[PDB]
Amino acid sequence: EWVMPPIFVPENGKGPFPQRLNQLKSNKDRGTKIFYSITGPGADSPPEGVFTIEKESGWLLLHMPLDREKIVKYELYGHAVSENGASVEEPMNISIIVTDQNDNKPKFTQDTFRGSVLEGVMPGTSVMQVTATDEDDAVNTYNGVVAYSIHSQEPKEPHDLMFTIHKSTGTISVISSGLDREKVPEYRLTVQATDMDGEGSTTTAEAVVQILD
Amino acid sequence: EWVMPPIFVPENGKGPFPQRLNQLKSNKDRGTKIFYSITGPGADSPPEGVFTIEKESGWLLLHMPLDREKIVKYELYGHAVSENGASVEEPMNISIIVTDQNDNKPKFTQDTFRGSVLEGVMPGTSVMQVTATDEDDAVNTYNGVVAYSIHSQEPKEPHDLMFTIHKSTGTISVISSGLDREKVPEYRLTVQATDMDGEGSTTTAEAVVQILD
Ligand SMILES: [Ca+2]
Ligand SMILES: [Ca+2]
Ligand SMILES: [Ca+2]
Ligand SMILES: [Ca+2]
Ligand SMILES: [Ca+2]
Ligand SMILES: [Ca+2]
Ligand SMILES: [Ca+2]
Ligand SMILES: [Cu+2]
Ligand SMILES: [Cu+2]
Ligand SMILES: [Cu+2]
Ligand SMILES: [Cu+2]
């Protein structure tokens, strides 16, 4: 059986609407006047109205720019029915997949994270864990893949490189010895999350580490 | 059977190329890797290469801007063959119709027409017939429908309106009496053929009428 191929539609389309995606046809046009229709989430089910089909021509229509972050793929079904009201074709699967654009910056779950670590802890230890999320595609592209780093550390005593972060998980570790509560009680780190695995747009949040002698 | 609908492609399309018209798919993709091809005048037959198809994806491609005046309609067939070398679908007819643009001016059969009429002829008689052709569509549009007229007459003696031309057939007639061989031997008319039934682009040729005793 010949089947309609899935339809790839890049999100945030600028062209005019409605947009013609594809066109259905039943070879039983020769014998009788045929009428086309579509059903499924996106047509007659919520979100209703996004996809429609011209009853007599069979043109699949898109009325709104799509947002991949909202719905990545729609699973609709096209129908063909003679004047009799009875279907003359088995429903056809119309898969409409939305391609991703990097239109979302990373966002930290919280503006500020609080953690704590002890005095004589050996380098390579865990302190706390911060997390940021990017709603873009993180499977086929890097538009959604988040990378972690540290922008600055205050104060810069005894050293400027007192902590570190795993680029993928975002858990902060003690990199250098010399932690002392009597000297410095709190460490204000400004952590950074950037998409494109470090090559794209960036956002920042605060991570407070109190020391425990 | 769900079949691919005809494909309308306006002639003289700008880029980019190749252009994706439609895409084929056999649901036997589920079982085996399928390979696609197309045959017929326009693909493998003259004019060869105009339409081709990506073997693994099944994208129908157009490689050159089309000219309707050359070929109005292509009748191709798409094939699906499994990796094993066996056809998995009955060939499907991919009909590609080219819609017309008004890109052809009328052309007179001759750069100059020679005709003759007698001196004492009564108004309303026929003299000669000029003809121009438009290679554009004259059935669905008026891009090819030609209308005739007279731009000038030299000399303009005894009168400026000595002749006339039927707007449809293009046969020149004497509208006014007063033809004299002793006074004026030749009449250099510059006749005009314009498409759009008189409202479009125009071209002109000359029609020389010698008068006879
Ligand atoms: Ca989006
Ligand atoms: Ca996106
Ligand atoms: Ca992103
Ligand atoms: Ca042409
Ligand atoms: Ca034309
Ligand atoms: Ca024309
Ligand atoms: Ca005489
Ligand atoms: Cu609309
Ligand atoms: Cu700064
Ligand atoms: Cu090409
Ligand atoms: Cu002139």
* Ligand 3 center to A70 CA (angstroms): 14
Distance of CA B174 to the CA centre of its chain: 32
Kindly list the residues from chain A whose CB atom is less than 8 angstroms away from the CB atom of residue B77: none
Q: What whole-number distance in Å separates Cα of residue A139 and Cα of residue A73?
A: 15
Taking the centre of ligand 3 as the mean of its atom positions, its distance from the CA of residue A204, in whole angstroms, is 14
Distance of CA B94 to the CA centre of its chain: 23
Residue limits of CATH 2.60.40.60 in chain B: 3-101, 102-213
C-alpha distance from A15 to closest chain B C-alpha (Å): 17
Q: Do A27 and B58 touch (CB under 8 A)?
A: no
Closest Cβ–Cβ partner in A5, A24, A25 for B25:
A5
Which tokens in the block code for residue A28?
Answer: 């039983």
Q: In what order do the strands lie in the sheet with B73-82?
A: B7-10, B92-99, B73-82, B34-39
Q: How far is A99 from chain B (nearest CA, A)?
A: 17
For residue A33, the tally of other CB atoms under 10 A from its CB is 9
Nearby residues for ligand 8 (ion, Cβ within 5 Å): A 18, 63
Which 8-state DSSP code applies to residue A197? G
Contacts 24+ apart (CB under 8 A), B202-206: B202/B105, B202/B106, B203/B105, B203/B106, B203/B107, B203/B108, B203/B132, B204/B108, B204/B151, B205/B108, B205/B110, B205/B111, B205/B112, B205/B113, B205/B130, B205/B132, B206/B111, B206/B112, B206/B113
Is the preceding peptide bond at A155 cis, omega within 30 degrees of 0? yes
Cα A11 to ligand 1 centroid, rounded to whole Å: 6
Q: What is the DSSP letter of A155?
A: S
Method: X-ray
- B64 CA → ligand 10 middle, Å: 7
Q: Residues of B with CB below 8 A from A92's CB? A: 2
Tell me whether residues B23 and A3 touch, CB distance under 8 A: no
CATH 2.60.40.60 fits B102-213, yes or no: yes
Pick the residue of A1, A2, A38 with the most B CBs within 10 A to test the interface with B by mutation. A2
Q: Do A24 and B4 touch (CB under 8 A)?
A: no
The Cα–Cα gap between A1 and A111 comes to: 55
CB contact under 8 A, B3 and A2: yes
For residue B67, the tally of other CB atoms under 10 A from its CB is 14
The two tokens of residue A71 are: 């719905």
CA of B204 to the centre of ligand 11 (A): 10
* Residue B10 in tokens: 């306006």
Contact B14, B65 (CB under 8 A): yes
Distance of CA B151 to the CA centre of its chain: 24
Question: How far does B86 lie from chain A, in Å, by closest CA?
Answer: 15
In chain B, which residues touch A (CB < 8 A)? 1-5, 22-28, 58, 80, 89, 92
CA A150 / ligand 9 centre spacing (Å): 10
| Closest residue in chain A to residue B79, using alpha carbons only | A2
What's the resolution in A?
Answer: 3.2
The single-letter code of the amino acid at B127 is V
Measure in Å the smallest separation between the Cα of B147 and chain A Cα atoms.
36
**Among candidates A157, A155, A133, A158, which has minimal Cα distance to A146?**
A133
Q: Report how far apart the first and last C-alpha atoms of chain B are (Å, whole number).
A: 75
Q: Please state, in angstroms and rounded to a whole number, the distance separating the CA atoms of residues A20 and B76.
A: 23
Ion ligand 2: protein residues whose beta carbon lies under 5 Å: A 68, 100, 103, 136
Q: How far is the CA of A69 from the centre of ligand 3 (A)?
A: 11
Q: How far is B1 from chain A (nearest CA, A)?
A: 6
CA separation, residue A171 to residues A133, A163, A165, A175 (Å): 14, 10, 6, 12
Q: Do A80 and B3 touch (CB under 8 A)?
A: no
- Homologous superfamily in CATH for domain B3-101: Cadherins (2.60.40.60)
Is residue B24 a contact partner of residue B91, using CB atoms and an 8 Å limit?
Answer: no
Closest CA to A42 of A7, A15, A16: A7
**Closest approach of A90 to chain B, Cα-based (Å):** 8
CB pairs under 8 A between A and B: 47
φ, ψ at B28 (rounded to 5°): -80, 10
For CA atoms A83, A87, A92, A95, the dihedral sign is: positive
Could you tell me the distance, in angstroms and rounded to a whole number, from the CA of residue A190 to the centre of ligand 9?
8
Contact between A80 and A88 under an 8 Å Cβ cutoff? The reply is yes
Q: Which residues surround ligand 4, an ion (CB under 5 A)?
A: B 67, 69, 103
Contact list in A for residue B87 (CB cut-off 8 A) is: none
